[PDB]
Design a binder for this molecule. Structure first.
Ligand SMILES: COc1cc(COc2ccc(S(=O)(=O)O)c3ccccc23)cc(OC)c1
Ligand SMILES: COc1cc(COc2ccc(S(=O)(=O)O)c3ccccc23)cc(OC)c1
Ligand SMILES: [Ca+2]
Ligand SMILES: [Ca+2]
Lengths: 204, 204
């Protein structure tokens, strides 16, 4: 009669999976809408739920990587945040590692977001006056003409450069929001959200 | 067309309610089984989910109070834990306040658990050698003959007293576990657990 505790542990693993998918959808939607405090509170919930899980499918792992990517991007201007065991890695550099690791299609939007994160990883350093740090970020990350324009900007110490204006933080955020909209379309059919939406719809 | 964001916020509130009921059931079951680390990880999850909730029904509030009560009881021997804004209140004193506030039937088991928490609030102090603290705990909490036996034990500084053995920490834990078993029976029918159990049962 010890099988009952096994069947309970299995059911809690099924419920945690549904809770994880739901909290990713909620986290993605909060990032898209600019709801900063809801993103902060939902990220805390997703991390806690994840610590209570032992087995993860490939889809659940991809889902977690997307949440980690959005968390780092949000923290992109927070140079005091240490997301990696190596304490020199800045938040935008950390988001770049995850963006190159996710098992996803490498379409034009993928490469545009990647290139925007690389320009901004340097620019944010420039903006805070950490010129030597921008040079170090440049070396860890690094097209050949694209590469030489950035090195010229770091050496010239011109933090407020027109190149950065052209491929702005806002530009990087809007492109990332377009991608999040495709993830939101894919996850809107998860079990928790679907059953919650039906309850709301039945009271209308 | 701003109604869609309202319907989303409503559905997330419905899903959070189901997640809360599920995490209480999981937390109660972990306490009953002696699964200390699962209790610790599930408590973290319940607190996070609760911070993402604005409206609470009376049932949800009762449910949260039971989780807070079990958390304090588990931490009953941790005299370094400060659960209240008043820093002098010990964990067992804090569990006593919640046990007297929950809207529940005051049956014989209720009063037995209450009386066991009062004896142990003092005993744990005694056991660590904080005699003046046990006297202070005694004054904040305090039957007339029952009251005088305890004061005699604090004054005599006899930490290893036979009275404490008779109404032991283990005794208090077992009685609290009987109560938790009735809560587990009531909550086993919540939506998340019920739908998770069906999925596990359909794969058998
Ligand atoms: C492979 O995924 C994980 C996830 C965790 C715990 O979940 C998280 C940890 C850290 C972050 S953050 O990006 O650093 O803020 C998360 C962000 C969003 C969602 C979950 C996060 C742990 C783990 O290994 C210990 C692996
Ligand atoms: C009325 O219930 C709440 C709950 C919270 C947040 O949830 C929790 C806070 C603290 C504890 S603990 O007992 O101190 O560890 C919890 C334990 C179990 C479950 C939830 C807990 C906050 C709140 O007001 C801010 C009111
Ligand atoms: Ca730094
Ligand atoms: Ca203390």
């Amino acid at each position: 009669e010890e099988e009952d505790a096994g069947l309970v542990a299995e059911a809690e693993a099924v419920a945690a999976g549904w809770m994880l998918d739901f909290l990713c959808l909620s986290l993605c939607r909060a990032f898209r809408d600019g709801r900063s405090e809801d993103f902060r509170r939902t990220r805390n919930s997703a991390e806690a739920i994840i610590h209570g899980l032992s087995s993860l499918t490939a889809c659940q792992l991809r889902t977690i990587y997307i949440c980690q990517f959005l968390t780092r991007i949000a923290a992109g201007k927070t140079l005091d945040a240490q997301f990696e065991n190596d304490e020199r890695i800045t938040p935008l550099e950390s988001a770049l590692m995850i963006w190159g690791s996710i098992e996803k299609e490498h379409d034009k939007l993928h490469e545009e977001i990647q290139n925007l994160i690389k320009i901004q990883a340097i620019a944010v350093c420039m903006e805070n006056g950490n010129f030597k740090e921008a040079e170090e970020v440049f070396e860890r990350i690094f097209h050949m003409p694209f590469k030489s324009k950035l090195l010229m900007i770091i050496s010239q110490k011109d933090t407020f450069h027109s190149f950065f204006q052209h491929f702005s933080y806002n530009h990087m955020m809007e492109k990332i929001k377009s991608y999040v909209n495709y993830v939101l379309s894919e996850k809107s059919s998860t079990f928790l959200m679907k059953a919650a939406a039906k309850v709301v719809e039945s009271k209308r």
